[PDB]
Amino acid sequence: SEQSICQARAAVMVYDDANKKWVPAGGSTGFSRVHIYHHTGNNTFRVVGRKIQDHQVVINCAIPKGLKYNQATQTFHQWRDARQVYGLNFGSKEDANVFASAMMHALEVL
Ligand SMILES: CC[C@@H]1C=C[C@H]2CCN(C(=O)[C@@H]3CC[C@H]4C=C[C@]5(CCCN5C(=O)[C@H](Cc5ccccc5Cl)NC(C)=O)C(=O)N43)[C@@H]2C(=O)N1CC(=O)OC
């Protein structure tokens, strides 16, 4: 049972450490609709994004308590897990604000 707490437009990127380059998540350049989903049973939150064109899930990652969410610019935000670096290149500042708000809220209530 998952409730969407936000939707934002972004091109989801992951960092290729070996080549020191951002690459499109899922291998597919383009914009996705990126949700934060809240599972109320255990108060968990995940980032789940699907490409606008073909619906591919290109990101599905946990939001752990204590995450450092970096707002590098008004339209490019990023964070890390133990394996990967993620970046969201938002379609607008408004989308970056919506998503950052929801993320920051999740991080306050975890
Ligand atoms: C895809 C378009 C994109 C858009 C905008 C700009 C904004 C700046 N920018 C970057 O990639 C910035 C520039 C410096 C470089 C250096 C390192 C990187 C990459 C790896 C992670 N990182 C960290 O700075 C992390 C952050 C972090 C801090 C705290 C907590 C979590 C995290 Cl993740 N610092 C650690 C220590 O992990 C990084 O983001 N970098 C983006 C960018 O140029 N482009 C264009 C492009 O790539 O065209 C070729």
Swiss-Prot record:
Location within or outside the cell: Cytoplasm; Cytoplasm, Cytoskeleton; Cell projection, Lamellipodium; Cell projection, Filopodium
Reported tissue expression: Expressed in myoepithelia of parotid, breast, bronchial glands and sweat glands. Expressed in colon-rectum muscolaris mucosae epithelium, pancreas acinar ductal epithelium, endometrium epithelium, prostate fibromuscolar stroma and placenta vascular media. Overexpressed in a majority of breast cancer cell lines and primary breast tumor lesions.
Residue ranges of every copy of the WH1 domain listed in the record: 1-110
Domain of life (superkingdom): Eukaryota
Note: Required to transform actin polymerization into active movement for the propulsive force of Listeria monocytogenes.
Family: Belongs to the Ena/VASP family.
Organism: Homo sapiens (Human)
Residues of the full protein shown: 2 to 111 of 591
Protein name (record): Protein enabled homolog
Assembly and interaction partners: Homotetramer. Interacts with APBB1IP, APBB1, PFN1 and ROBO4. Isoforms, containing the polyproline-rich regions with PPLP motifs, bind the WW domain of APBB1IP. Isoforms, containing the PPSY motif, bind, in vitro, to the WW2 and WW3 domains of NEDD4 and to the WW1 domain of YAP1. Binds the SH3 domain of BAIAP2-alpha but only after the autoinhibitory region of BAIAP2-alpha has been blocked by interaction with CDC42. Interacts, via the EVH1/WH1 domain, with the Pro-rich domains from VCL, ZYX and Listeria monocytogenes actA and with TES (via LIM domains).
Main function: Ena/VASP proteins are actin-associated proteins involved in a range of processes dependent on cytoskeleton remodeling and cell polarity such as axon guidance and lamellipodial and filopodial dynamics in migrating cells. ENAH induces the formation of F-actin rich outgrowths in fibroblasts. Acts synergistically with BAIAP2-alpha and downstream of NTN1 to promote filipodia formation.
Recorded domain comment: The EVH2 domain is comprised of 3 regions. Block A is a thymosin-like domain required for G-actin binding. The KLKR motif within this block is essential for the G-actin binding and for actin polymerization. Block B is required for F-actin binding and subcellular location, and Block C for tetramerization.
